[PDB]
Amino acid sequence: TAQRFSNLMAPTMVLLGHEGEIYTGAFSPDGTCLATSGYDQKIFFWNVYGECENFSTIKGHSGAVMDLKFTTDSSSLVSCGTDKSVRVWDMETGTCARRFRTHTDFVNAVHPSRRGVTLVASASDDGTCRVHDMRTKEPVKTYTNRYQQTAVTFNDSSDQVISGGIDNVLKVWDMRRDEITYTLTGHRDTITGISLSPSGKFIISNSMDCTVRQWDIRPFVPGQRSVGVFAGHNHNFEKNLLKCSWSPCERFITAGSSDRFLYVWETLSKKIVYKLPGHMGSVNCTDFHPKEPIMLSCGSDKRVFLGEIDMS
Amino acid sequence: LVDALPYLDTEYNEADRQLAMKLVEHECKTFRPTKNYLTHLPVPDYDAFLTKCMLKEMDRMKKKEEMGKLDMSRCELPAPSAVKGVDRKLWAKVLRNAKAQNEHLLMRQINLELMDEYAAESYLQRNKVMEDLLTHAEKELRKTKEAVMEVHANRKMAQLKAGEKVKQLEQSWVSMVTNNYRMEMENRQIDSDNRKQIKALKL
Amino acid sequence: ARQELSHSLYQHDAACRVISRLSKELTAAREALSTLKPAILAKLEEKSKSLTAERKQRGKNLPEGLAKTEELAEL
């Protein structure tokens, strides 16, 4: 016998059925299921518990799904891809609720507003951040930056759009001003993913310089906004948009890695807590289950790995 | 509520001990043991089970008097003098004593002769039993020492694990108090807006 | 052993008087940080400097008219 930490059917589960590089993966905020997609364009849904049966599979993108996020109430899945389109998928219906056909190049990342009216921030190879409101065909905001933007998130109040890209500097756009109120400078190479802490105080940002830097995005900060730097993971010649994510208790951080290892760092000490093997290619996206200590990792190897971790 | 954790509160010095007890001394100088602290324990009946005889014997040594002793001069048995030989009873009492000692010495000889056969064996056997008790007692002593030590282990492993949370929460609390107070000064200073708003409204 | 047990519990309970005062005084000090925003007595001693020791001079006996133990039984 051995210790157990979750309702998983086994301490590690291997989920198989994707037909191409899995670029993105996310849990439902209610903890019931998870959704994953990538170069094979289908979006696969998996239950977190029991047999983890692939209970649904949405199709419709005409391109790789680069990024994929649940809305906070779990009633809709936002997804975006190389078909220049953001789509919102209704969970109960399984159907495209909206199709924001207004980007002019590949959409690299997407993030729905955490609360209030549902807004969808998106960043694209056209260089623009756009915020789309479900109620209008036209975007609410278009923030033209000069160079291709690869990652985006709102702040927690959903009134600043944070983005990064080929220029390595993160922009922070203030949605009442329509100006960059400040920039976060420090990455040596292009950003591959940005993720917002549950409390909203901090963001992490992954970059092809093989570091994750934690930034303080609170309105007042008494000095430097760079909180700390994590290292250990690696980005290879495939130049995938390796994502990053927060533990729901914020004690731990993850980032994708090209070295096959699933990395977890402790937020306070910056020590690597897990460096789990088992993938056979780039671990493109990593996420934590919102209620229970379970790790998701999605590989370029077409495999999804679910497993327990001791979140002590 | 006492909440000391001596494996975490390690700073406690002898100089602190003297100062701490001096404070309780300035209190216990002003607060005295008037309460019956022993109400959770029975009052002892020191004379439980004792007989009327044993009470008087306790009261003798309680008043610190020596115990009675047997007179043993009967073994030496002085002869009577010329002024006591007229008492026929006092002569018989000498002879009857001399007869009694003759048999005590006979039984002593029989005991000693049997003791010469078997004392060496029985004393050796006695030691062999007594040795076993000592080793078995030292086994019990060693076994209980480790158990006391194990309790110190489980205490340190608890207090140190809690000591990290205390140190994080303390360091977190002090960092926010200074940061939050700083913001209170900023939000006052940014009410310079009320100044510019007036001047811009007059324009 | 019963003498020493009473004294230690006393000394323990006497120390708890000190813990109680300082703990609340620490708590009030931390509460400030947690919310920080930008003569007859002497004549009484004089009278005490006789009456706590003097009053044998007049209280020489209990009153004679005070109830006996057999009388108050009829209350």
Binding site: R176, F220 | V166, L169, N180, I190, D193 | -
Partner: peptide, 30 residues
Amino acid sequence: VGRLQQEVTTQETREKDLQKMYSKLSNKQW
């Protein structure tokens, strides 16, 4: 430990209130 977590959490909620103010204030200075 329980008391310190309340002391921390009192400042955590105090901090959010002060920064909702600071954003509201600085967005009025602008």
